[PDB]
Amino acid sequence: VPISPIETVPVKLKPGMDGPKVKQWPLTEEKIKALVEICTEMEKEGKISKIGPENPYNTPVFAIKKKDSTKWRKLVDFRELNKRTQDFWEVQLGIPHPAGLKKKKSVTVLDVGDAYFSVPLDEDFRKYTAFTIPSINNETPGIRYQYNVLPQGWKGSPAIFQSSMTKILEPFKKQNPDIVIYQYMDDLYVGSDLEIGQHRTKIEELRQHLLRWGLTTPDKKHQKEPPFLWMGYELHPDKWTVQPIVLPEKDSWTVNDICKLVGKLNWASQIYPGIKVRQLSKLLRGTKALTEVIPLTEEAELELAENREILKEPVHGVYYDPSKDLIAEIQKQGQGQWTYQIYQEPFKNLKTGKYARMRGAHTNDVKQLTEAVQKITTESIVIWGKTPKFKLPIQKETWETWWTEYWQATWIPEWEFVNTPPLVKLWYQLEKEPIVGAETFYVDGAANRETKLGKAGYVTNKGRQKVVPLTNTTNQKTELQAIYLALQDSGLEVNIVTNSQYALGIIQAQPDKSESELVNQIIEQLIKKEKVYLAWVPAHKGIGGNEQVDKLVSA
Amino acid sequence: PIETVPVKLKPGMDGPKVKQWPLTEEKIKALVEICTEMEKEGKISKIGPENPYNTPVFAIKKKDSTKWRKLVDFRELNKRTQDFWEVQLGIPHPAGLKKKKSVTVLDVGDAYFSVPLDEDFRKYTAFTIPSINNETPGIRYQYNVLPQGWKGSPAIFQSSMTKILEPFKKQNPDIVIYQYMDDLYVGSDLEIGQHRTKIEELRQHLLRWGLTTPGYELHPDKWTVQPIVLPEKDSWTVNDIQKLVGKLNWASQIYPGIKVRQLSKLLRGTKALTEVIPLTEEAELELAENREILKEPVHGVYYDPSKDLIAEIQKQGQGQWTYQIYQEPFKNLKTGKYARMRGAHTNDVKQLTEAVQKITTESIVIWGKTPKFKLPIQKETWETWWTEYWQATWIPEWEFVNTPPLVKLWYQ
DNA sequence: CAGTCCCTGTTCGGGCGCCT
DNA sequence: TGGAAGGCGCCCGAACAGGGACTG
């Protein structure tokens, strides 16, 4: 008879499936001595038992040395058990952010020791855990054991742990409504507005409560001592910061280098404002292998330079004060890159961040601004449960023009203009009505599917005309191309009739940037015009000169 | 006390697994309190990560309500229970409800809380309350009774419902009563006073039978249809005639009698857009004949109960929104326009949300079904804002379209 | 008409970062 | 050495998925 700590959690295998059978890795006696060591320890504590041949299951175990630590870390690879283990609904919905914590008089950070190992596994599942234990090389076939608790490396361990832990803490919290406990994995952040004494008291009460359930709180706890190391941050009484970020100086740059670099810069962007990853990532496009080594472009080097400069200065975030409004301000960084700062008191930042994403083949600054606002809103809701008041580099009138005229539903929540160039503008506006006294260009283009050869051209009410042969092209590109010609060959005010739905659809959305050079040139021309009216008519209806450019560009 | 009607999933279909979305603090608070009281009452009970299933939850306030209501997005669950409610225990739909001079909507969802739920089914009602800034992990529950907004719920409670109603039906033979999900729709031709009066009566009946009503008023005989119209101008330009022809061209996809030839003739040459051209007799004739065809009913369009309703919405600017409900392309069961809704001239998303709810409501009164929406908005835009504006206890299906308007067919 | 092509949006999987 | 879990973020590219015009 073994004893029973705390309520268990029913587990199962994906129906009609059975436990894992695999033999181990050839291992040095290094790893094996680092193993049998802690192997023989658990038996007494109750964290394992032994099995005969009765237990037809086999899984590997080998050890990895603790980072910044003395003793070795034992990790079982359950991958073949995981694959066959029931799916769980993960209760961990995201990572807490320092910027979302409120000011607290007294603060403590505790770890539950050997946390996974303090939680009873499920009775009838225990068997499936079976691994084989090495004496040493060539020595002995070994001894096979089974977990009575949650194994490091299973796939149900985190969820059951987090859920059980919650169940235990719940009553302590119901009795202490004013204490704040951030519970993340086995890490605990307790904080209170109590005086540091009554606080140390209540912390003790809590350690004892966790004890009643067999959960140990060793003295690796941070007691009064700021800064607390929590979730990769340092928490001081009035400020927080990221723990120092070491960027690689490597003279030779490979692909995986660029990756580690960018990942780190992204991590940094939560606090250091203005980080830019665009040029750097440009380097990673369509590469052969993670090992391949590429040189930095002038463009990438300049960027990396100003990021290292950004990183020169130390910076800190503050905490969140519900009595005060939330505020997010955005700056346009060029090339479709955006930065933002969320704060409450001017200049004291809760957090910062960036939005770089390019959506669509054709876009503009107003759309991308909208996208950023949404990214920021959702992020804000996760952290503070509310939407920031926005400060945006876009004239109120610009925005009113865009959202009212656009065919999609579009909206930004409460916001105000901040005049902080570069401002976001619409670069041209299509007329709502045909222009009196402007030359009307009936434009057309067509391509041959086989030859991929085509023509693009136009005819005018003034008798003006053009046709141009094009090679290796599409119907779409030629429709665009006809419009382009009409723009080039016309004065400052022009009417243009097209039967292309595609072409019209792109231009009417007033793009300022494209993945297509031809659309970019069309944009360039649209920006130079004073007045442009685009109109659509159906094809083959022999409409206007539109049958006569229709019969012109097939010729 | 009660015996639980067993329930199964549609053949060969796993339960719902849908990630909870972030909630605002006001909403998480309202949910934590609502749920606390519901647990004290045995209606739901806490569960654990062993249960693989999850459905999103959030909170809303009905129009003018001020009281938080819990709302579960059971759309996935319902799609996976579909044969149970459609085929087996389902509800017959009165074709007179749309004809009644007035129809009030009442929230009866509370009643579903009486009946136990099949024990082996509950694992599927799983939902997770999240926390601000991920302070705590998710608090998972599941329903021990009939959940509000599940399609199975008004099915299993049907016998009990008619049981409670039979007195009122006998008493008032003419009043029509429909049940859709958490709602009861009550129509009559009585004048408004008589009406509200009788609805209070029905309230009493529900109260003494063990239910509460914390309804909306509708007027279907007043519901309007939006025809396709052609402009009347004293003089026409090349551009006017081009727009007209493109419109008539699109229209013929619907009414095949439309003809563009006499009108296209006036467009023969390459002319200035702003140039005025007079209409030939043949063009005048073709045009008026066309204006007549657009008065006629479209041919061979009738509702088919076995088919889904699709609804399309267009943003017309200036607070105008046009829509069409259809089963087959170009056969429109209904067309409409809405103006000056909440959010007009200020919030597109709020107006769209309002429009989606009005349209869905008419769909329930008319066919007793909700349409699948084609929404003129970016997925992320809608998904960030919609639950802020949602005042209804059901959620329709939707997809997102981007459809520039070469022609404005549906609004002058 | 069914079947291609263009084209343009979405989703998914795989890499890195960071936490336990 | 080379090696486990779950969570969240980014960036890319390859794949699927669908609308609208042209063609057998």
Curated annotation (Swiss-Prot), chain A:
Changing D111A: 5- to 12-fold decrease in affinity for dTTP substrates. Strongly decreased RNA-directed and DNA-directed DNA polymerase activities. No effect on RNase H activity. Loss of pyrophosphorolysis (reverse of the polymerase reaction). Multifunctional enzyme that converts the viral RNA genome into dsDNA in the cytoplasm, shortly after virus entry into the cell. This enzyme displays a DNA polymerase activity that can copy either DNA or RNA templates, and a ribonuclease H (RNase H) activity that cleaves the RNA strand of RNA-DNA heteroduplexes in a partially processive 3' to 5' endonucleasic mode. Conversion of viral genomic RNA into dsDNA requires many steps. A tRNA(3)-Lys binds to the primer-binding site (PBS) situated at the 5'-end of the viral RNA. Changing F441A: Virions contain primarily p51 RT. Changing P158G: 34% loss of polymerase activity. No loss of RNase H activity. Changing W402A: Almost complete loss of RT p66/p51 heterodimerization. Complete loss of polymerase activity. Changing S157A: 74% loss of polymerase activity. 56% loss of RNase H activity. Changing D111S: 5- to 12-fold decrease in affinity for dTTP substrates. Strongly decreased RNA-directed DNA polymerase activity. Slightly decreased DNA-directed DNA polymerase activity. No effect on RNase H activity. Changing W402F: No effect on RT p66/p51 heterodimerization. Changing E225A: No effect on RNA-dependent DNA polymerase activity. No effect on RNA 5'-end and 3'-end cleavages. Mg(2+) 1 binds at D111, D186, D187. The gene is gag-pol. Residues 228-236 are annotated as: RT 'primer grip'. Changing L188V: 22% loss of DNA-directed DNA polymerase activity. No loss of RNA-directed DNA polymerase activity. Changing W415L: Almost complete loss of RT p66/p51 heterodimerization. Changing W267T: Complete loss of polymerase activity. 87% loss of RNase H activity. A motif (Tryptophan repeat motif) lies at residues 399-415. Changing G263A: Complete loss of polymerase activity. 25% loss of RNase H activity. Changing Y442W: Virions contain primarily p51 RT. Heterodimer of p66 RT and p51 RT (RT p66/p51). Heterodimerization of RT is essential for DNA polymerase activity. The overall folding of the subdomains is similar in p66 RT and p51 RT but the spatial arrangements of the subdomains are dramatically different. Changing V443S: Slight delays in replication. Changing K173R: In strain: Isolate PV22. This is Reverse transcriptase/ribonuclease H. The chain holds residues 600 to 1153 of 1447 of the full protein. It comes from Human immunodeficiency virus type 1 group M subtype B (isolate BH10) (HIV-1). The record marks F441, Y442 as: Cleavage.
